[PDB]
Amino acid sequence: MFIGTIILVLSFLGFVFNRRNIILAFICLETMLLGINLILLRNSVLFDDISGSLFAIVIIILAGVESAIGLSLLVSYYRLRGVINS
Amino acid sequence: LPLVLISLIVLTISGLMIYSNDSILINKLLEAFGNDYNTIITQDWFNIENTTLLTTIGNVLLTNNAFILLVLAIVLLLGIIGPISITMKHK
Amino acid sequence: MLILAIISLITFVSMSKLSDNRAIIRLINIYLILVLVLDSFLYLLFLNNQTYTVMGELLIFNSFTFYIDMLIYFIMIVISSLYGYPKKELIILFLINILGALLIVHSNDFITLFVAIELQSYSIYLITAIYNSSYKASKASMLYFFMGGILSILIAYSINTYYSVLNSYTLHSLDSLIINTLDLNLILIALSLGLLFKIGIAPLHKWLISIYENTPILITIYISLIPKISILSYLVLSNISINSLVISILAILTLLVGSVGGLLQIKIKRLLAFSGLTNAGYMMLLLLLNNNEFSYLYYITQYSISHLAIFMIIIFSIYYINYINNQYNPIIYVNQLKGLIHDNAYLVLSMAIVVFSFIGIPPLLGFFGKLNILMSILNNGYYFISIVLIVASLISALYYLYLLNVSIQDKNNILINSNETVSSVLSYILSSLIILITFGFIYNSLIIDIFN
Amino acid sequence: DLLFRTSHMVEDLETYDEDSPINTSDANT
Amino acid sequence: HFHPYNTLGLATQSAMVGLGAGVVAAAARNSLATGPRNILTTFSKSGGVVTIFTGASIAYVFTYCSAANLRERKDGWNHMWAGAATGAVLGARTKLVPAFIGWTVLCGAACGLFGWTGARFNADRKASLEQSPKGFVQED
Amino acid sequence: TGGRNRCFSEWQSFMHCTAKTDAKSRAQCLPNFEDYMECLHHTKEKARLREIESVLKQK
Amino acid sequence: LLSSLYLFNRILAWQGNVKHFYLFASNLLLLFIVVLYINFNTFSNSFQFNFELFNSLNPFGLSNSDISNGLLFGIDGLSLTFILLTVLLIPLTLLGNWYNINFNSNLYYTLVLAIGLVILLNFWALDYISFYILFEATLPLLFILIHIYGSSDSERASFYVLMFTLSGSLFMLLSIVVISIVLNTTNFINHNLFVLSLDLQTIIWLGLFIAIMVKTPLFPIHVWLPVVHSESPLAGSMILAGLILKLALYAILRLLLPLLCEAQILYTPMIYIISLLTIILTSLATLRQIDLKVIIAYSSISHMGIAILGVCSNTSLGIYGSIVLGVAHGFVSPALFLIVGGILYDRYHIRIVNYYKGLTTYMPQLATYIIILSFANIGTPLTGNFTGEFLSLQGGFIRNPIIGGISCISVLLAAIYQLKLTNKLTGGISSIYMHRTNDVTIREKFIMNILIISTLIIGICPQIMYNLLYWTVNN
Amino acid sequence: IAHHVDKGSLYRLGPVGINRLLNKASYNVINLSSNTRSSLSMNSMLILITIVSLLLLVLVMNVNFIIVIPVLISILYI
Amino acid sequence: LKPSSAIQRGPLNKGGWDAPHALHNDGAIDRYAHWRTFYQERFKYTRATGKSTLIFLVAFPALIGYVAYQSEG
């Protein structure tokens, strides 16, 4: 569980110290959701069959919709598709 | 950067230490870092495993916990209706 | 019967001519009839508040949660009437936001909880930027999205550590485990602080507030109230940490001081945003309890009706300003509505009683919200937190009365020549009349929840 | 104290938590 | 009864707690402006928030254990007479008006009068002392 | 929601302790509970192994 | 039957033909005077709460018939004297303000009539829940009455109310919560019986005590009062109802007997010093102050400070002197404030003293209603007040002789108010005013004269409605 | 001079409308560097400081609860 | 640009017969009164220390007279 906490913490304080490039912050926040699954999957492997790995397939299916709403909302961080502005 | 990130890396290392089992001390903080040292797990042999299955059991649990599947149907529904009604801009 | 309503009216918004001001009348009347013919579950609700569980992971607590979803239906009917009578095609995701909120008020186990808090949060991210021809909403939605993502992985990391210490998931399996391994306590306060993103506890403070001022007023009524009740109703339904073991009390101390020290504000939206923040901070104090939910269940309704009311009153006060702000947001300054008592002063009376609500003068609300709050506190023994709650009430009352004192000074030049704008007036009159006549039936509920 | 606004132009004043520089005085497309 | 405290034993540990708080927080407050530079000049911005933390413990808990040695037996009335000395370091925060530092001393004392222990427990039905037992009723 | 576990064998002798209400006897399940815990994490197993390898280290 | 007054509510609905809505609002209180006077023909003896009404209706919405009486229980007792203080003052406000309505609106009368009924229900309350739900319901009406209709900076004036008398109030909420969670009952008329042991009988005393410290002011805050008195809006209840609103000495007498049978640990080392140095300091604050209403506001603070040391005396003389100050000051001081507001503010619109001096030379009988009334505030050899502060000094000297031995300088400092005031009010030049108008408005004469006769007619002390030491003593 | 003292009692109320009116500007000046643009970075560093300060104060709690300056220094801001 | 709909706003009038206001102003005396009725400016000077300590001391002397003489025998 070193393997998941370290990638989670580095994604987290990458999301803190991110004074460049909004999308690197956005993908660090993405990689949090796979830093957490390396914790979850190895806890399930150290335990058993499907108890936590059900939550793992849930968080994968939902992390998809996370990135989908995040893109389709980042498109509207401005005007829409493109016009005159400043 | 360094003036907060060094302290934050230390505090989050202590958080990974706080994931340890039950000791109300700093002994558990050192215990998880030595978790590989005293131990190598022992596998076993097949006592009555009839049918072969790896992610089949995931769908068996997805049948037992069917309601979260029918609700993440709704979250995928939201994942398609939202980007319509936030970017299409109907006329 | 919400899923059937959603799948019906997503098909109904499909193949629609983009009239899109009638479908909300159908959703309003549908939720009205659903409440009117689904209140019959209250007889089968409680002999001794007997819980009922869907498939092991979802819980129906017939005294608490069966009131919470009724409040959700009620305030949704009010919002749906507020959009009737400037809009885009959105009530589908209003209803699915409701579906997520009701799942987290019914969620026994963390898989359902996490799915539903994230469904709910995605709904908030979307509703923030449906009005996409803004520069306010464009910034606010992305800010809400990124921090909801952080707080989402904080949720999931709390519960993943919870799974790492115990191979179960249910809090039904916590079952007064009194050996109380210390990481169970730390996991649980981490899950508490994770769910407490929405209240904007004073270190997590400022970020919600710019979002509330950067949404249109027809939206910031909806998301200063839905997750405010939702995540806390989960948090009181299961009492995670019996006391604070000083972690949460510090959070509410710096909240209820350090958000009421946010006194001087000229923007209206900021002002009642801090109001809805600190009155949400109130009900965090009986998250610090055990076996106490009556004060919480009463304080939600006997806050949220009035929160809805003051937003509806400053909706009605757009008509009287002789200036407006941006296309999406009309009335952001306090000093816009100066001489309102020389306009239709009956709504000034309503605004008066719903702000005297929030300060808690006795005979309408505060002697029945804050009295139950304080008896729940002093039942436990949190003697210091009582007097800091009192200080919070006084200093909150100061910027509350700021609204009434700017409301009724003197008008420059406006009295009367107009047409009418009504038939939603019975909604605001219903909320104001239920605010200042609850002292009549303040004992019937005391018996009814004693039998549930 | 007290402040008020009825005319907002030359926007983006930095030194404020939230200033009187609004978001839609005029738009562009 | 009670036990008198190790005044140095609390004192040096509290001073290290205050200095660690001055490192982890009073140097974290460097996000606030656009004067950038990282390490050598952070404490140019932040010399006036360090020892506001570290001096606070040396003011407070030193006074607290000394009061426990003077008016003994561990009463809450130590705290009101403790935290006033904390106001003295608050007085060193603002050397403008000594009337205002006496003001902040007495108000910090009244603040310290109450914060003895938040989230008290083991009071199942609280706030009912009981008299000597003669089949008592008016408590719980 | 508990698949065929490598630690299922300590639910029953924990849950049959909480079949009767001895979780309000508050200690009758603690041997059962911490045996469930040693099925979970093998803590005292691991301390026992650390002890015997320390004895190995001094030969 | 039931709807015999809802038909009269139809009379009120059609009565807005004549658009004043004022004469009906006076005749309503005029009928309320008789509706209290017939009620005064009942409380004979036996010293229990005579009438009864539940009015929160545990098994109804408006009735009183149950066996599990989870309701408000609004009823009468030996409080009734204050009720007989009240209903002869409630029209007397409105008639005192009948002319200078200041036509922004008529609803001013509805506000004054509203709090006039609300503090009647305060006197008709019994329970801690019931007394609290009326003890601050006045305050929104007070706030609207200060905010509009005030003269000075109303944003400065009105907020001091809902700062302070809400502050002490929701401190009283702590004590009400604690005694409602110990007893799980609050029927203060029916519970002079508790095994409440001390050291948790003590902090509830503190929680009640700083509340009534705010209401009847003491030297921690007493600036609450005189700026409400400074910007005093619209003569009738500019002061007079907010002057009877500080008859929360009914709280210190109705409460603080029935479950403070052991509070002598904090009786003498707290109340007497905090009373005595108000009667010294706050009464001494009227020398240089120049507003004409502030100098009698401080006199009101002084009279109530005398009265509460009478209250805390454990002697029946002290209690009875306190109650008769509660009626006596509520007679004399509303008359003085009606003088300075109704016929001396309206003549001049100015409340300072420095260019205000000089009367008796164009307003003759105004000064004759000044000097005897200011003597009735002075202490007055006959009963305007006298036997009030007399018996209060008696009880205060009995319980503790030294602080009474300083507290008898109250009569000196009472003289310091008016006898500095009056001679530099009636000094015959009047060279900055323009010889304004008639003094008595022939109805202002009635409103001053009714309170003057009501003060003076308490000579034979009528104690019939008060078995005085019914429940306030100790062995 | 008794009146002059009675205005020192307003100096127990004037500052309630003045020291709170310094507390408001002190509370609104913190985390308000950019505050119109770039508001993500303020809040992200802020919640880092949240989890660091809160976990560190849990560590301060369960060693010596008498050390109650870490909240009192936080009240030095507002 | 669309704002401020067609509700015709008149001019309001607080109404009375004209007061002859049979006085004068005395602007310096109004200045003195307005200086009296405001005490923002109480800067806690060196005389104010003697004042506030005199109030607290007159409290303390009456206290030590009272609580040590609760009973006269």
TrEMBL record, chain D:
Signal peptide extent: none
Family that this chain belongs to: Belongs to the complex I 49 kDa subunit family.
Protein name: NUCM protein
Residues of the full protein shown: 50 to 78 of 466
UniProtKB/TrEMBL annotation, chain E:
Keyword Lipid biosynthesis appears in the UniProt entry: no
Residues making up the signal peptide according to the UniProt record: none
Principal location listed in the UniProt entry: mitochondrion
Record's GO cellular component terms: respiratory chain complex I; TIM23 mitochondrial import inner membrane translocase complex
Keyword Transmembrane (UniProt): yes
A single GO BP: mitochondrial electron transport, NADH to ubiquinone
Keywords: Membrane, Mitochondrion, Mitochondrion inner membrane, Transmembrane, Transmembrane helix
Spans traversing the lipid bilayer: 8-28, 49-70, 100-119
Protein's cellular compartments: Mitochondrion inner membrane
Membrane topology reported for the UniProt record: Multi-pass membrane protein
Protein origin, superkingdom: Eukaryota
Name of protein: YALI0E11891p
Organism: Yarrowia lipolytica (strain CLIB 122 / E 150)
Taxonomic lineage: Eukaryota, Fungi, Dikarya, Ascomycota, Saccharomycotina
Shown residues in whole-protein numbering: 19 to 158 of 198
From TrEMBL, chain F:
Keyword DNA repair: no
Keywords attached to this entry: Disulfide bond, Electron transport, Membrane, Mitochondrion, Mitochondrion inner membrane, Respiratory chain, Transport
Compartment(s): Mitochondrion inner membrane; Mitochondrion intermembrane space
One GO CC term, this protein: mitochondrial inner membrane
Bilayer topology annotation: Peripheral membrane protein
GO biological process: mitochondrial respiratory chain complex I assembly
Disulfide pairings: 7-39, 17-29
Superkingdom of origin: Eukaryota
Function: Accessory subunit of the mitochondrial membrane respiratory chain NADH dehydrogenase (Complex I), that is believed not to be involved in catalysis. Complex I functions in the transfer of electrons from NADH to the respiratory chain. The immediate electron acceptor for the enzyme is believed to be ubiquinone.
Protein family membership: Belongs to the complex I NDUFS5 subunit family.
Subunit structure: Mammalian complex I is composed of 45 different subunits. This is a component of the iron-sulfur (IP) fragment of the enzyme.
Protein name from the UniProt record: NADH dehydrogenase [ubiquinone] iron-sulfur protein 5
Organism for this UniProt entry: Yarrowia lipolytica (Candida lipolytica)
TrEMBL record, chain I:
Keywords: Membrane, Oxidoreductase, Transmembrane, Transmembrane helix
Record flagged with keyword Oxidoreductase: yes
Region annotation Disordered: where it falls in the sequence: 1-18
Enzyme Commission identifier(s): 1.6.99.3
GO molecular function: oxidoreductase activity
Superkingdom of the source species: Eukaryota
Keyword Lyase found: no
Membrane-traversing stretches: 52-69
Protein name in UniProt: NUVM protein
Organism listed in the record: Yarrowia lipolytica (Candida lipolytica)
Positions spanned in the full protein: 4 to 76 of 93
